[PDB]
Amino acid sequence: AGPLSGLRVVELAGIGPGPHAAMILGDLGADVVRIDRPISRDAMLRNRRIVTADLKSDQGLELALKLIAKADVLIEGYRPGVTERLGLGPEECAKVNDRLIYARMTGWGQTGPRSQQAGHDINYISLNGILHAIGRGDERPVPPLNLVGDFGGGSMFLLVGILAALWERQSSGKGQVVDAAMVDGSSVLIQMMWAMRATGMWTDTRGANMLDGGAPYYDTYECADGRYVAVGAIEPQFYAAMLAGLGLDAAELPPQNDRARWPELRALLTEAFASHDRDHWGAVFANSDACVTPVLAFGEVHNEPHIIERNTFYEANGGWQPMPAPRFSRTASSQPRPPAATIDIEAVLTDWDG
Amino acid sequence: AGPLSGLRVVELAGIGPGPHAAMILGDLGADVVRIDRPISRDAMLRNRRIVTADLKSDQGLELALKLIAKADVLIEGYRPGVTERLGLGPEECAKVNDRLIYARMTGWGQTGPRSQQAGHDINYISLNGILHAIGRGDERPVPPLNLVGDFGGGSMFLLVGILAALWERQSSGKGQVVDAAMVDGSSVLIQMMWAMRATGMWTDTRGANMLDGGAPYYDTYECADGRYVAVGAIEPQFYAAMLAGLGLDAAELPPQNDRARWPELRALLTEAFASHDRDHWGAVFANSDACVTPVLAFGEVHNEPHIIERNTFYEANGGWQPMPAPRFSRTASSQPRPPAATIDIEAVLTDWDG
């Protein structure tokens, strides 16, 4: 019963960013109908009704269009031109529903020399400087999973575009097309580095900056047990709290920001964190402003008190899944409805009156 | 002149996710007024009017509330309780404007055992399993910059919450509080891995999965010149195209998905990519679906045809910055207005009719 209660969304089944956007809409209360090819164990397909249609057939196109005629939002993540050839392109949908927000989720965008080329997250962040910046400096770049292209710079930007176009519709009375390209959204996601590059505050050298692992006060450390803590003590007063927790005398260490001595500083902090296990540090720093936290593996997360107490996760079935985010004080989101059986497309049409 | 034209936003000056959310609002056309302490070279502060006020004073609090009274959205990123203590808490704002979307940007959230504790991006993603999953398997975890907590799982969720709450207000006539905690938003951002963990499609072992650098067909490779390409050839037909371009005979290699022979497969791909420079592979794979792209450093991004042709960046006096995302067919966003001089707060009030 979240803030998107009442919003009608038609989702053309796809992979990665599209269904993630659709999931978040459903999480927040939207009525999302996913059209798939003629019960899922994919938790991402929570908060849906699933219908089936052959979009290449006359019948399937007609039904999809009747559904779209009644919706607020359409999500598609095919190659540019695919919906157009199916008879489901923006100009065709406009004929039946000029209030539709037509949301197009791609990596390279609707136009441009790479627009028809296959790719995945790693390719989109390769082209815009992001991938080059991730990883240790003495090694080739490492992919930050598909967190940055598919999701942070992908579905998240599709969602901002959908909801912004809905705001616009309040006064125009009309929808329009949202072109969310991972290559664009991930670039805005990393705008802080573009800003910092311009003022000398960030360099193109991998692994040699404040927030990429280059700084001894912003990195992970291996403990006695081979598990890790994360140190994020940027501000001097947090850095000071970190040293106090370690029992180190600041007068005997290199200054926090003397980069010429960062290897020496890191060596001293490495020795300190290596002297006890991760959970020892977890306890020492549990309540302080030192910005030191245990690095938990997925399987351990459900046992952490802050995670438990805030209900960041729920138990779906044979696994934890994240509860909806963000949170709303008045129209709070429900626990997600699990994936259910395929339902009849005509039953949905009856429900929506189309 | 983007879709958010007419939306009024008050930003209480902060660091990281708050200003990034405010930026994207302004990018898309919102009228964003940022209250600072009594010309910026920070490109993130594009698309604002900056005013100045001492929030701890009687005059400053009164002026802030007058502005807030006329706004749609307020963004604050302080420790929970700080705005309350200042007289700017949600209950105080409700008295002057019960249409206000009160957006609270934090790492740990408004409540819970860590709610008053300092932290940065690395700490939030340490506690929820994300950081553990990033990096090579034989090394300690590496921070994916602050892309995942501060932005992907942070400002992006604040934005979804703001715009979703605005949709809700169309029917209710009222605002509410958005509690965007990076610990929550980043967990939803990584929901695909929680889904996959439940069905045996992802493991807690770092560097040993399909999308974390574990798979030879989803990783970077060093070329002859010490620069890199990204390979994302997941689908068999894209994988085949990749091998074709490398001139490798598929019948002589281990099968793509025989994980027992992944080290053998990677060694063969490593030798192949090492035999020529990055530029060469760009030419070999330029118009193919091999999912092989050059890994560009920030400084080279502006020279890439796909980047140029789509105007993903614009030049600010000094350096490149990302254009607004996503894109809108009918109400297109303008090129961002650079940071400007501070203006009289009473000028803004007069403009807004406060």
Side-chain angles (χ1 to χ4, degrees):
Chain A
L4 299 182
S5 174
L7 187 67
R8 290 167 172 190
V9 180
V10 166
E11 172 196 359
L12 299 186
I15 287 145
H20 182 73
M23 178 193 79
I24 292 165
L25 291 170
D27 282 356
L28 307 198
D31 185 349
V32 184
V33 176
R34 174 167 154 118
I35 306 172
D36 218 327
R37 298 173 285 108
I39 189 147
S40 173
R41 290 177 18 198
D42 178 0
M44 192 184 301
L45 300 192
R46 64 192 200 194
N47 289 324
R48 308 294 217 288
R49 285 180 289 173
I50 306 289
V51 302
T52 260
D54 180 5
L55 306 179
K56 280 139 187 221
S57 100
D58 292 334
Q59 193 201 103
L61 172 61
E62 196 186 23
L63 292 163
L65 278 173
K66 272 157 185 208
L67 220 61
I68 285 158
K70 290 328 270 233
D72 294 295
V73 176
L74 171 66
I75 289 169
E76 67 92 15
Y78 305 130
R79 195 176 20 87
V82 169
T83 57
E84 283 87 348
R85 266 178 248 105
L86 289 170
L88 287 169
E91 294 180 36
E92 284 300 295
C93 292
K95 285 171 168 172
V96 302
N97 187 183
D98 67 8
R99 288 173 56 78
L100 188 73
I101 309 313
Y102 192 112
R104 313 199 73 163
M105 182 68 241
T106 66
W108 297 128
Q110 287 302 302
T111 64
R114 294 186 188 263
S115 61
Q116 294 291 311
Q117 248 192 141
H120 285 282
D121 176 295
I122 197 178
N123 301 114
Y124 313 130
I125 62 163
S126 85
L127 218 73
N128 63 192
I130 296 173
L131 177 55
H132 186 281
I134 293 174
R136 305 290 170 191
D138 61 336
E139 303 162 25
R140 72 198 188 274
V142 72
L145 318 184
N146 57 340
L147 284 165
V148 180
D150 282 346
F151 306 129
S155 57
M156 299 311 295
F157 275 88
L158 193 76
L159 286 164
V160 170
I162 287 162
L163 301 166
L166 293 157
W167 164 269
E168 193 280 339
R169 185 175 77 169
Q170 293 183 8
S171 72
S172 71
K174 293 204 182 88
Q176 60 180 308
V177 176
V178 172
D179 167 22
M182 298 184 252
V183 72
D184 294 337
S186 61
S187 298
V188 176
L189 196 76
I190 203 175
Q191 188 273 337
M192 189 186 82
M193 278 63 188
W194 291 104
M196 284 185 302
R197 279 210 337 125
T199 58
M201 283 180 62
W202 195 268
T203 75
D204 289 9
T205 298
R206 190 174 46 270
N209 300 282
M210 192 186 295
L211 306 182
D212 62 5
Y217 56 81
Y218 195 95
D219 203 2
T220 57
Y221 284 84
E222 187 166 345
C223 303
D225 59 337
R227 305 180 176 95
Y228 311 94
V229 292
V231 175
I234 301 171
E235 289 87 345
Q237 65 274 23
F238 303 155
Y239 180 79
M242 185 269 285
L243 300 183
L246 296 178
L248 299 176
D249 183 348
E252 297 298 330
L253 309 192
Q256 183 191 358
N257 275 297
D258 176 2
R259 292 194 46 154
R261 290 180 71 196
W262 268 359
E264 177 184 352
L265 181 56
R266 184 180 310 266
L268 291 159
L269 302 171
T270 291
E271 178 182 48
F273 284 111
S275 71
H276 295 292
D277 295 357
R278 176 197 77 187
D279 288 354
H280 178 275
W281 302 121
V284 165
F285 292 113
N287 314 104
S288 85
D289 285 345
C291 303
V292 180
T293 47
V295 177
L296 298 187
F298 297 119
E300 302 191 271
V301 171
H302 75 282
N303 284 336
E304 186 64 26
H306 192 70
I307 300 290
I308 294 159
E309 290 289 290
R310 287 192 67 257
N311 294 292
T312 295
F313 295 87
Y314 68 100
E315 280 201 277
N317 52 8
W320 295 89
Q321 295 304 327
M323 284 287 276
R327 296 180 191 204
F328 302 85
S329 66
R330 187 175 38 81
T331 61
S333 290
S334 302
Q335 189 177 289
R337 298 175 303 280
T342 282
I343 68 145
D344 206 66
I345 194 157
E346 293 276 5
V348 176
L349 277 178
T350 288
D351 178 35
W352 280 7
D353 295 85
Chain B
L4 298 181
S5 187
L7 183 77
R8 292 168 173 189
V9 181
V10 173
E11 170 191 6
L12 304 186
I15 282 135
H20 176 81
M23 182 193 74
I24 292 167
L25 291 175
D27 283 351
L28 302 207
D31 184 347
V32 181
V33 177
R34 167 172 159 119
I35 307 180
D36 253 295
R37 301 169 277 114
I39 195 143
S40 186
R41 289 171 17 156
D42 177 1
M44 191 181 292
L45 302 184
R46 70 199 200 183
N47 286 326
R48 320 293 221 276
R49 287 178 294 172
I50 311 283
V51 300
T52 250
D54 180 5
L55 301 183
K56 302 195 186 111
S57 81
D58 286 345
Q59 203 191 93
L61 170 66
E62 177 171 54
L63 287 164
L65 287 167
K66 283 199 183 138
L67 217 57
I68 288 159
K70 295 294 313 228
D72 292 299
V73 178
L74 168 72
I75 290 171
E76 68 90 16
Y78 306 126
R79 193 181 15 104
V82 168
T83 59
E84 287 91 341
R85 246 175 260 118
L86 283 172
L88 289 162
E91 297 170 34
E92 274 307 296
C93 289
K95 293 169 167 188
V96 299
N97 188 173
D98 71 354
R99 286 177 62 79
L100 182 75
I101 307 318
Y102 197 111
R104 315 196 72 162
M105 185 66 242
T106 65
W108 298 127
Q110 289 300 306
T111 54
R114 293 180 187 269
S115 60
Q116 295 295 312
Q117 180 175 56
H120 285 280
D121 178 297
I122 194 173
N123 302 117
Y124 316 127
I125 60 164
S126 59
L127 246 234
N128 66 190
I130 296 169
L131 181 57
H132 189 281
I134 297 161
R136 300 295 172 190
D138 56 349
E139 318 166 15
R140 69 191 191 280
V142 66
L145 318 182
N146 61 333
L147 288 162
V148 178
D150 280 347
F151 306 127
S155 56
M156 300 309 298
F157 279 81
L158 191 75
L159 286 168
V160 167
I162 287 162
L163 302 166
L166 288 163
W167 162 272
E168 192 279 342
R169 188 178 82 166
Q170 306 181 355
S171 64
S172 79
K174 297 188 112 103
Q176 60 185 306
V177 180
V178 174
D179 163 21
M182 295 184 251
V183 76
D184 291 340
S186 61
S187 298
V188 176
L189 201 74
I190 204 172
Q191 186 276 336
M192 191 178 90
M193 276 64 189
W194 291 102
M196 288 190 299
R197 267 214 330 141
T199 59
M201 288 181 56
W202 196 267
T203 74
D204 291 6
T205 299
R206 182 174 51 266
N209 298 283
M210 189 184 294
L211 305 173
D212 64 4
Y217 57 81
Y218 195 95
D219 203 0
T220 57
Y221 285 88
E222 191 172 341
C223 304
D225 56 343
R227 294 185 179 90
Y228 313 91
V229 290
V231 177
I234 298 172
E235 291 88 344
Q237 66 276 20
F238 302 158
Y239 183 77
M242 184 278 293
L243 299 182
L246 291 179
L248 298 172
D249 165 4
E252 293 297 330
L253 311 188
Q256 184 191 0
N257 296 127
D258 184 358
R259 296 190 44 151
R261 291 177 74 189
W262 270 0
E264 188 182 341
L265 178 62
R266 189 181 301 266
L268 290 158
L269 299 180
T270 293
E271 177 184 53
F273 277 115
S275 71
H276 291 278
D277 300 347
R278 179 195 72 190
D279 271 357
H280 181 260
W281 302 121
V284 163
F285 299 110
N287 279 122
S288 81
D289 283 345
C291 295
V292 179
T293 45
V295 178
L296 298 184
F298 294 120
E300 313 185 86
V301 171
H302 77 280
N303 286 329
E304 188 61 26
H306 191 75
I307 297 294
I308 297 159
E309 286 184 46
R310 298 191 60 255
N311 298 287
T312 294
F313 296 82
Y314 68 103
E315 278 193 283
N317 305 28
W320 297 91
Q321 300 294 338
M323 284 285 280
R327 304 169 185 212
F328 303 86
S329 64
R330 179 170 47 78
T331 57
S333 299
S334 300
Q335 181 170 297
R337 297 176 307 281
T342 293
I343 73 182
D344 189 19
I345 184 148
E346 294 274 11
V348 177
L349 280 175
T350 290
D351 176 33
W352 278 7
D353 284 292

